[PDB]
Design a protein around this nucleic acid. Structure first.
Length: 123
RNA sequence: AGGAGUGGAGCCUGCGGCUUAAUUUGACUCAACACGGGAAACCUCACCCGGCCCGGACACGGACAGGAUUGACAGAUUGAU
């Protein structure tokens, strides 16, 4: 509870990158849900297609997947690792995706308390 | 001084010429010519006719997760799943 929800994606996408559990993309990210093993999805409200959100909110809800609301979709390309770093630590090449799906969690508890208390409050 | 010969004959293998889409090529007195350990069906293979592939490291710019190449049944096309 010491960390905010809008920054709660950061450390969990870092600790799950070491196990290759981040579905960059949209089609293969949605097909990970049809493997019935993914655990969370993030929708960026800065969107481009009205057809795009109404399918993914229909897929994640009926198969019991919650949601993390972050605004911008070029912003989500950083923590998935889809952006190339510069020499001193800046994303010199910005490539941002609008759908991020995790499959397996990292081995920690600094995010595994805050994502759980964000989960249980909307039940 | 001799012996066996070779050069004549048939065939086997080299080398020139001619021929060819190509008949890959080096070596030309001893000191090139059953030599390249060279007895090539394919491979060897260089040569000829046709076709596939990148096995183009890395550095930089674009495309870029409303995507970059990739792989693939059938049908036609093909020498050819």
């Amino acid at each position: 509870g010491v960390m905010d929800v809008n920054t709660a994606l950061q450390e969990v996408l870092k600790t799950a990158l070491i196990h290759d559990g981040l579905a960059r993309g949209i089609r293969e990210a949605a097909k990970a849900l049809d493997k019935r093993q993914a655990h969370l999805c993030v929708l960026a409200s800065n969107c481009d297609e009205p057809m795009y959100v109404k399918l993914v909110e229909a897929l994640c809800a009926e198969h019991q997947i919650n949601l993390i609301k972050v605004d911008d979709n070029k912003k989500l390309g950083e923590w998935v690792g889809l952006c190339k770093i510069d020499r001193e630590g800046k994303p010199r090449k910005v490539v941002g995706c609008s759908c991020v799906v995790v499959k397996d969690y990292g081995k920690e508890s600094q995010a595994k308390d805050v994502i759980e208390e964000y989960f249980k409050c909307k039940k």
